[PDB]
Amino acid sequence: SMNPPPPETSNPNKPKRQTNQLQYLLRVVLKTLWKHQFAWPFQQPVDAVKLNLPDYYKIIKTPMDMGTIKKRLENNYYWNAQECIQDFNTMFTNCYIYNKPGDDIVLMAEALEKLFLQKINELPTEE
Numbered sequence: 001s002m003n004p005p006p007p008e009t010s011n012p013n014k015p016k017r018q019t020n021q022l023q024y025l026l027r028v029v030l031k032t033l034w035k036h037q038f039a040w041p042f043q044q045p046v047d048a049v050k051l052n053l054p055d056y057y058k059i060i061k062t063p064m065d066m067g068t069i070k071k072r073l074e075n076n077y078y079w080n081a082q083e084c085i086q087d088f089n090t091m092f093t094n095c096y097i098y099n100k101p102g103d104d105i106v107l108m109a110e111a112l113e114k115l116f117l118q119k120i121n122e123l124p125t126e127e
């Protein structure tokens with residue numbers, strides 16, 4: 001078990017926007033989660049080699065992480081906010097799929113997801 005290529009963060013063929021909702025996802029949502037004490041496991045793709053998780057990419061076929069989301073937002077990769085919200089939800093779900101209830105990493109994901117939900121509850125109406 002090598003690592004897979006990371007998710008795409010650059011693709012000139014993909015149409016792009018910078019909507020007020022996407023600006024909120026960067027300035028409020030990503031920034032709030034990134035600074036949290038429990039962000040670090042999520043700030044880059046899972047390194048299955050260094051973590052000795054040879055089954056990780058056997059189980060997880062839609063990897064996602066906040067490093068990827070941060071690059072997507074900074075590079076204006078998205079067309080809409082729903083695409084970015086889906087990336088956050090994929091990241092949390094992958095953690096819950098791979099790990100066991102009550103594991104430390106699951107507790108970390110749950111704490112970040114609570115904050116994520118609190119912030120996207122106030123996603124502004126698209127202008």
Ligand SMILES: COc1ccc2c(c1)C(c1ccc(Cl)cc1)=N[C@@H](CC(=O)NCCCNC(=O)OC(C)(C)C)c1nnc(C)n1-2
Nearest residue numbers: 040041042045046047051053094095098099103104105108
């Ligand atoms: C860069 O470091 C990363 C990156 C990603 C991680 C993890 C670590 C971390 C991470 C884990 C604990 C804490 Cl406190 C924080 C993180 N979790 C991985 C999944 C994983 O490694 N599972 C091994 C399970 C083996 N059990 C284990 O060793 O338990 C002991 C025996 C009590 C020590 C895992 N699953 N999803 C993610 C994200 N991650």
